[PDB]
């Protein structure tokens, strides 16, 4: 079970599954979102990156393992809705 934890526009934590066909990709959020964490095989992974989307803040948030505070990230870093994001997980 591969799934991502992300916050919507209203700063609410939600979980969405990942489609593993022809790679790892996510789409159809329907709202501005900021990806928080990625889980592959019911475990937390680090060192992931996007091969088509350039966004340092989400990479920095994902790669850190400790608990984070949602009061430090502004609305600027939020990605636009209906965005196709691909994952490159090391293995």
């Amino acid at each position: 079970m591969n799934f991502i934890q992300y916050i919507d526009d209203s700063y609410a934590v939600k979980v969405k599954e990942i489609n593993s066909s022809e790679g790892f990709y996510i789409n159809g959020i329907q709202t501005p979102f900021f990806i928080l964490s990625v889980f592959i095989g019911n475990k937390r992974v680090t060192g992931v990156e996007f091969n088509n989307y350039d966004s340092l803040p989400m990479l920095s948030v994902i790669n850190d393992l400790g608990n984070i505070d949602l009061n430090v990230i502004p609305q600027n870093y939020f990605a636009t809705a209906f965005t196709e994001i691909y994952f490159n997980i090391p293995f």
Partner: protein
Amino acid sequence: MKIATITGVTKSPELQVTKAIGALILSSDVALSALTTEKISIYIERGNGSNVILANKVLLKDFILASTYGTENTQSDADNAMIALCELADEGSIYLADKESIKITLEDLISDKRYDLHGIEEPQQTNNLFFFEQKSVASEEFNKKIDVQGFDLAIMTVDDSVSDLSYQYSNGQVVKYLPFELQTLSRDIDPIQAVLSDGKVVQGLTDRLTLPLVAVVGIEINKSQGSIINFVVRCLKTV
């Protein structure tokens, strides 16, 4: 003042403006109808967070169309193939107190194209600012209703899969429109959209429509599956 010039790279750096400006002049050697993917992002950094967002990765074509509606239109020269003056304040210019700065970023630029950004100063100060917002549809549902109260201008994408557009006004009346009637009504307030360098004039983009919203509280889209319909709405409010 000359804010920046971008050539070669596919992404502009984080451009910072400190003095008070009220309008942005965007110039390029690429025509208005040839803009495909370039996006802009403008915000004001008030301090320890709580920054004010005026545009978040808004398409350049929609940003230009939503700001040059009315008597004015995009310009052309013998050196620049597209010039557009987009205002950011109602009457004067944005006011920064102690450390606020205006940060502007360009994304998805073309490698072999040139862009230039200039800022216009004003002798006045104001707190009424323009805000851009984006709305979309799931592309897997036939119809959808959105609320457009407060917004005074919208830019909608144009596709052959859109059948009906329903307008709900403040008095409760509901009026149904076809795309042809919508375009005809749109081209009745702003007959000319752009003037080319050679001398020809283009009266409308082939895949974008500008809708003025007066006393309109709801918009219903009746379409067919297979495409994503995008609306970019512009509003004015006090920060």
